[PDB]
Amino acid sequence: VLSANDKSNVKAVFAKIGGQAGDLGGEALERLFITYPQTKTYFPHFDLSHGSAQIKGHGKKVAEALVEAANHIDDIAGALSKLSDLHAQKLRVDPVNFKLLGHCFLVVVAVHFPSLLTPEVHASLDKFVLAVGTVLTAKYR
């Protein structure tokens, strides 16, 4: 479930972010690894030095997926369909980790755009990130 105002708030967030999305994706990953060190176990061979090409590269990919989810906000499940296979079937990612990355993305938005993230926009973006995590954990069987 996402209301019409929720969809409007998510669109406002990502329009504001614009081309910065990739770099924000990189910061969210960095914050994830540092604050929740158990998440590194999914990336055992990553160069984890601040601003590594791997973190920046993968961060771009994560953010682009979020941009696609936002642009296809009425059909998130269809937009991230193939990515649900990778995370659920292949990588077997513990569902609690998606909550952690979503929170880190909110932190990154808060750091860069404090006036954007009003209480109501916070709520919408929370619902959006949790919907993304739900889609990516949809099919485990």
Partner 1 sequence: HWSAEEKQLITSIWGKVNVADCGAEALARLLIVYPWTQRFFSSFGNLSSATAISGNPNVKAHGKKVLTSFGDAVKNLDNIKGTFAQLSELHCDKLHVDPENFRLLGDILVIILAAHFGKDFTPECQAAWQKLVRVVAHALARKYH
119 binds, among partner 1, ligand HEM, a copy of itself, none (CB under 5 to 8 A by kind): partner 1
Per-residue burial over 21-36, b if 16 or more Cβ lie within 10 Å, else e, is bbbbbbbbbbbbbeee
Neighbouring C-beta atoms of residue 43, cutoff 10 Å: 15
Provide the total of helices (H) and of strands (E) in the chain, helices listed first: 7, 0
92 binds, among a copy of itself, ligand HEM, partner 1, none (CB under 5 to 8 A by kind): partner 1
Distance CA 60, CA 57 (A): 5
Chain residues 50-79 in contact with partner 1, contact rule CB under 8 A: none
Stretch near partner 1 under the rule CB under 8 A, chosen from 8-16, 61-69, 77-85, 88-96: 88-96
Task: Report whether 50 belongs to an annotated binding site.
Answer: no
Q: Residues in contact with partner 1, total (CB under 8 A)?
A: 31
Task: Report whether 103 belongs to an annotated binding site.
Answer: no
Binding-site positions? 58, 87
